[PDB]
Amino acid sequence: KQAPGVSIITAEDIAKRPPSNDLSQIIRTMPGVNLTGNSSSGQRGNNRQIDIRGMGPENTLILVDGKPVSSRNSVRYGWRGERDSRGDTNWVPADQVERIEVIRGPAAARYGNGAAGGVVNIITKQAGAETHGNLSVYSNFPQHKAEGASERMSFGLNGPLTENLSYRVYGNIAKTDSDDWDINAGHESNRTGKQAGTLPAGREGVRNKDIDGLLSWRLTPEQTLEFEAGFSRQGNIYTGDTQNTNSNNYVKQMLGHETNRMYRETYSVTHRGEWDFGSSLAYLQYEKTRNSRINEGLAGGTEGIFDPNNAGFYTATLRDLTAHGEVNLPLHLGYEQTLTLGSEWTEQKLDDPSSNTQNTEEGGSIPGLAGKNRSSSSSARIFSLFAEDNIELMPGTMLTPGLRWDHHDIVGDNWSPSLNLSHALTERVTLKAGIARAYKAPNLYQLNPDYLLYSRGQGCYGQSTSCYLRGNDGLKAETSVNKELGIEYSHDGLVAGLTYFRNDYKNKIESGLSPVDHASGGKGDYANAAIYQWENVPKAVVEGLEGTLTLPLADGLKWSNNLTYMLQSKNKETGDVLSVTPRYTLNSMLDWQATDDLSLQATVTWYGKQKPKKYDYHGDRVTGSANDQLSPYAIAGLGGTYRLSKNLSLGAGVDNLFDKRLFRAGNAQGVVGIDGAGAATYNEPGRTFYTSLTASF
Template sequence: MAGREGVRNKDINGLLSWQLNPEQTLDLEASYSRQGNIFAGDTMLNNGAAFVSSLVGSETNVMQRSAYALTHRGDFEWGTSEASLAYDYTRNWRLNEGLAGSSEGAPSDGAGAFTSRLRNTRASGEVNLPLSLGFEQVLTLGGEYLYETLNDPGSLRTQSFDPGSSGLPALAGFARGNTKTDARSFALFAEDNIEVGSRTIVTPGLRYDEHEEFGGNWSPSLNASHKLTDVLTLKGGIARAYKTPNLYQSNPNYLLYSMGNGCNAGQTNTGGCYLVGNPDLKPETSINKEIGLALDMGQWRASATYFRNDYKNKIIGSNDFLYRLSNGRRVQEWENAGKAVVEGIEGNFFIALTPSLDWNTNFTYMIESEDRDTGEPLSIIPEYTLNSTLDWYATEQLSLQLNGTYYAKQEAPALNQRTNQAYATAAQKDVDPYGLMGVSAGYEFSENYSVRVGINNLFDKRIYREGNAADAGANTYNEPGRAYFASVTASF
């Protein structure tokens, strides 16, 4: 098994704020970050070949991000406003990994490296208008524009993929060598925060999205809160959410390849299969509902919320082929699945034990999280998660913290949805419940300088990844052991 993979992070951020007059400010922000991994030898299929072993301790991928933003804020007699123009540029350099067989997910000797480049340009603005039209209310109006581009030359390095040749069907939009894709979209939104009496607030909202490839969509929402008593509040809401396919899911020039583990086992396998983008996808939609109670007794507070999200047209990789290439390999594409549901309960409890000691606990309990077509879980998650934190402010400068997290059992999947084949019984291994604890201490030398040190995973609980779900069930991740950290913060 591989050890824990680390990272080298370098970050620098700057903010220049100019107060134009008492009502307006102009902020210019710039940031740069670099994250390079420290390879520990872990691969998708636990392949420890000589080349992979020689890379242990070195960087096999580096992520760099540059971001700039110009923001204007106004606070006028008629209301407030905010407008911004932002640009970010992300470069992801990585050694090419094997695409199939025992080398899948492992850096390949002699395959070189590629850099993918993602650029986003975003313009946004909104105004908040206090009104007295029958009820006291604050109307929010706004909009945003997004232009995004992705250039990933590594996505077309499989030279044997050539639809449209030798009498084979053509793939709409496919062009050998076209490694760049882009998309433009905009949105308009309105929300009104209405005080209906002294105890009730109702917030209707409406958002319109327009995407150059996927057309328009209306997303309404309605939220409300009502004070049942001076200390007990009932809150609830319902909203329609909308998500367009990302740049590679809709791009017929973006390829993923499998020698067999990602192909339907019930179909003849000759040389594996390709998964390509589909320009005819439909956007994902969901109806999200929640209702809950919040109790505020001053020294202690508690809340519980029930939530349910019903998804439609969820985007997945198809396991049924469109056609075969001349070499026998199958061509599959991203498609819209049926329905899925995520349902659960979230809660929080806070109490000030003494003027200097706070105890805060939150939990999440999952009632359901599954694909309606197959009954399989959408992801491997604990049945419930509990987080608890004690904060002790020993002096005005010194603070101490003790925190703990408990994860309930995580059940293994029974069906490989990519191959449409049941996992072997021996591979359906659950992750047993476990807990982690941490401690830290912070000291403020002044309002400008502070330091914090601590230990994560105090009792050195470790979980080792045993492989992918085909042979390891839910044991597909590492839980790192004990780790020490220290940070220094300076502001001026």
């Protein structure tokens, strides 16, 4: 379940610690994984997503059955590197998941674009020899009414049609109620003048509808052909969230209402080949995402609030195309090795009728940029070749060198080499070392010279004057040399391991610090605004420790621990943080198999201190409550699963036994009328009872 760099979560695991709704809840408990925003602003801070080794969630590649999920690329990427997105780990319903693979650092670089942090591969339950199916229900019950309860119903059904043609289908309906509009009342940052009365929001709610169909066709003994279609729909339940935590009547009108809906549609063709020489796989996925939400402004304090002058919904459309071919070849030589060879092709078309609409009246005009009716359209194609050689030098030792080459049709050529070594020092002890250079293509917002944000000064680096931020098709890809050295003892279910990891982070893309130019014209003081671009930061570094320890107390009883400790996270240009994570994270489960038919689980999570950014948007040291830190805290939980028969199981338990609660005070830094909240940017839910029921043949 735990080796150096890699973690498996099983169906049994998902069953014993059931997630409310989103899988982030259980994925986050792996070594090296945190649940954070992408950068340090704290904006959309209750919209936290999976972060691997402090590299940010933009650098965590989500797969379902080896096929990319790109849906969040349909939400506007803002000035501070946050999207008003709930993430991409809530597309597959928990109880139809067979297992989840988390691959962190050098082992993950081979998966290419956006695996700089690592890969999360959500694997579905597949067709059997006989026909099987299940019906799963979960429902939680919070102590405090403010906090949103969650309800979940999902079914699965698979088997053969013929001797040579199988199917699997699943369908899910779920809802997570929003936190009450006022849950953060009495905890909010100091708010004065026009902003008096404003509130930082609790967690957005969501309604889910997921339907997947798959047909497997075994054409010959050594040939399988898979067809699947996927239809999902998330509509939110709004509870007052805005980028800057400003308010207006339109905001208040929409409390309790759907203000965004994401439709995600997937069709996939997969051919799987198995013959004497070796093995083949190749797939075509077409992902179509419709991001329908309410118009928001793109300037200063109006960036990320419902725009009352332009009321109503727009729809952003993401058409994502993925094709991949691989062959694996057993090879006999001076060393017993295996060669895998592969191409990959991806196309991302983005239609956004809202992001590209900032006009140049107030700040003056930009040479090369039309003020009105700029294109809605952005697109990027990567072509990729790769080979990986998995070389046995001698029993116990694998050396795995791989080369990936990527041609980005704007940014240019990338060379991502990799080397992964594992060494049996003993039967019980294994040393593992890895150094790879991973790859990040700029997102379609960073890349687009039509994409334009504006501030009168309050968000401008190194001045108080009006300034534009502009997309930059001149950008380099972000690369990271992910190093890792680890050791693990494993024997008779006794596991003890410790890994050190360092990712040297080159060309991290971010809102610029120096004006590249000035505009001409516009109104009064705001006239002739400074122009910044999305720039590559030369150097940043993350560094830390992953530990695991599993002790079998008795035959019936297992004590498991995962440790993350984050040593360093530094933008070497500004000296500020990349992300804000807990200094450490210790997850502790006691698993007692009390009877043949009863299992009992106690868990504790310890979170270390959390520190905010040192510098504001200007680059100036922040002061007062913008410096506030979150103290270390713990969350404990009990549960059980009572098996009534081979065909019926029940679960029940309590998350957060001792009701430790935290409250979003606002964003990290001060603005006019809204004091900063430092690290206090998210809501930690209180005591919550839950029950579950699973019927299966």
